């Protein structure tokens, strides 16, 4: 909910492209507890707009299917921070990224900093390197995480 | 990484599942997952075998489970009486406060493993969680759950 893990000098234009949710963590297990859990979403693609906003494509397990969801994150006065505008979450924090291999982000509901925090380690390819996971664990150190998930059922998907 | 000198009759009683971890996300996937079980009581028999009482989620109700595990040639290792080849490994315990164990199954195409950090009372514990995580370092775990006490 704290820790200056904020990303400095973030060029939102360079994170365009598809990504796979490699790992995710929450401070309240109820959030990711199941495929049906609310924050159990899989980032499909990040698409920046000319105005500086962020279009996020997500897949959600939904009644046996795979509902495609699109969230528009709006840039704020602070770079690396975007408003969601979802009903459960309201903020998006880019913690770190090399633009080329990994990307770290959390969604928050500023109003309930305590437990609404959800972070994900995103990767460019469905392959896998231990680098992305090292960085991610480093960021969660000072965070009240109570559930942690690591994926290998593959990004190709075994959970749609 | 088993514990040597385990005196099974000592771990008798009520325990609380403080934390769990599994190699497969499906194992603890949802409060209804198959190994998403909460230890309720440990019951050592005079002969040296072990009875485990669990709390699971079946038919919207938290039903009690009862596993029977028999001794092996190795202390701290128990053969579960089930069709699926199952063993229970007690990695470490201080008897008075916490206990760490894993549950295996060699009938799976690959490996299916789950471990829990148990505590004697409804209280979180920094020593317990610390031990637990260093014990998992050499195991391929893909999911970790930590509680604030409940079920």
Between chain A and chain B, the number of residue pairs with CB atoms below 8 A apart is 33
Between CA A120 and CA A107 the distance in angstroms is: 9
- HSE-CB at A76 with a 13 A cutoff on CA atoms is 13
Chain A residues within an 8 Å CB radius of B146: 145-147
* CATH (residue range A1-160): 2.40.128.20
Method used experimentally: X-ray
Nearest CA in chain B to A23: B142
CA torsion angle B150 A25 B144 A61 (round to 10)? 90
The alpha carbon of residue A33 is apart from the nearest alpha carbon of chain B, in Å, by 5
Query: What resolution (Å)?
Result: 2.5
Chain B residues contacting A via beta carbons under 8 Å: 25, 29-32, 141-148
Q: What is the DSSP string of B40-93?
A: EEEEE-TTS-EEEEEE--BTTB--EEEEEEEE-SSTTEEEESSSS-EEEEEEEE
What does R_g of chain A's alpha carbons equal in angstroms?
Answer: 14
Q: Which fold has domain B1-151?
A: Lipocalin (2.40.128)
DSSP-derived 3-state class of residue A126: coil
Sequence ranges of the domains in chain A? 1-160
């Amino acid at each position: 909910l704290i820790v200056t893990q904020t990303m400095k000098g973030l060029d939102i234009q360079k994170v365009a492209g598809t990504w796979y949710s490699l790992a995710m963590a929450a401070s309240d297990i109820s959030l990711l507890d199941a495929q049906s859990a609310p924050l159990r979403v899989y980032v499909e693609e990040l698409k920046p707009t000319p105005e500086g906003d962020l279009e996020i494509l997500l897949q959600k397990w939904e009644n046996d299917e795979c509902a495609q969801k699109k969230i528009i994150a709006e840039k704020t006065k602070i770079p690396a921070v975007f408003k969601i505008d979802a009903l459960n979450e309201n903020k998006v924090l880019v913690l770190d990224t090399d633009y080329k291999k990994y990307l770290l982000f959390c969604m928050e509901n500023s109003a309930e900093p305590e437990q609404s925090l959800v972070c994900q380690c995103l990767v460019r390819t469905p392959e896998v390197d231990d680098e992305a996971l090292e960085k991610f664990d480093k960021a969660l150190k000072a965070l009240p995480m109570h559930i942690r998930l690591s994926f290998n059922p593959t990004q190709l998907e075994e959970q749609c």
